Design a binder for this molecule. Structure first.
Ligand code: HEM
Length: 152
């Protein structure tokens, strides 16, 4: 369970993401696909993209990044009281998209890496620790919902 101070460190870096969620989403998903290329295979609409240049030019990828980061932002703003938000997300990601928890870990790693590079003013060590806590909580709770839904 995060403290309010930890939540505020999370939200204060998220405020910078929200200056340009589209550009942050491109950096984050491109980092994910470069570090873990198997994750790109889950996106039937753009799994054919071959290079970072093609990824940066893809409007479909840009929209996926906006949608995902905005949904994550809504979860973070609930400061752990995210039961309602996790229901539809767990159901689609477990049952339709088939996204292992390990891939959510990979995405969390990409988020941390991009925030560390882009936001040293709001992503020092304590802030990064708070974001890790928040993402670990998200993954813990969504893993429990995956299990309820029949996806180990
Ligand atoms: C913080 C974690 C994530 C959030 C908040 C998130 C959020 C979303 C949302 C809101 C949608 C659209 C509605 C839906 O189908 O549920 C979506 C679609 C999708 N997500 Fe995620 N997502 C996350 C992680 C991932 C990861 C790691 C992958 C794959 C490695 C993934 C794969 C997909 C796919 C394949 C779709 C459909 C995309 C399309 O229409 O082209 N998601 N996600």
């Amino acid at each position: 369970v995060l403290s309010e101070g930890e939540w505020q460190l999370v939200l204060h870096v998220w405020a910078k993401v929200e200056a340009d969620v589209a550009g942050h989403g491109q950096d984050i998903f491109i980092r994910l696909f470069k570090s873990h290329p198997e994750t790109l295979e889950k996106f039937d609409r753009f799994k054919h993209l071959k290079t970072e240049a093609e990824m940066k030019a893809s409007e479909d990828l840009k929209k996926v990044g906006v949608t995902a980061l905005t949904a994550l932002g809504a979860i973070l703003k609930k400061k752990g009281h995210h039961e309602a938000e996790l229901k539809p997300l767990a159901q689609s990601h477990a049952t339709k998209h088939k996204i292992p928890i390990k891939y959510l870990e990979f995405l969390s790693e990409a988020i941390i890496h991009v925030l560390h590079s882009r936001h040293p003013g709001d992503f020092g060590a304590d802030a990064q620790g708070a974001m890790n806590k928040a993402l670990e909580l998200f993954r813990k709770d969504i893993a429990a919902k995956y299990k309820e839904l029949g996806y180990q």
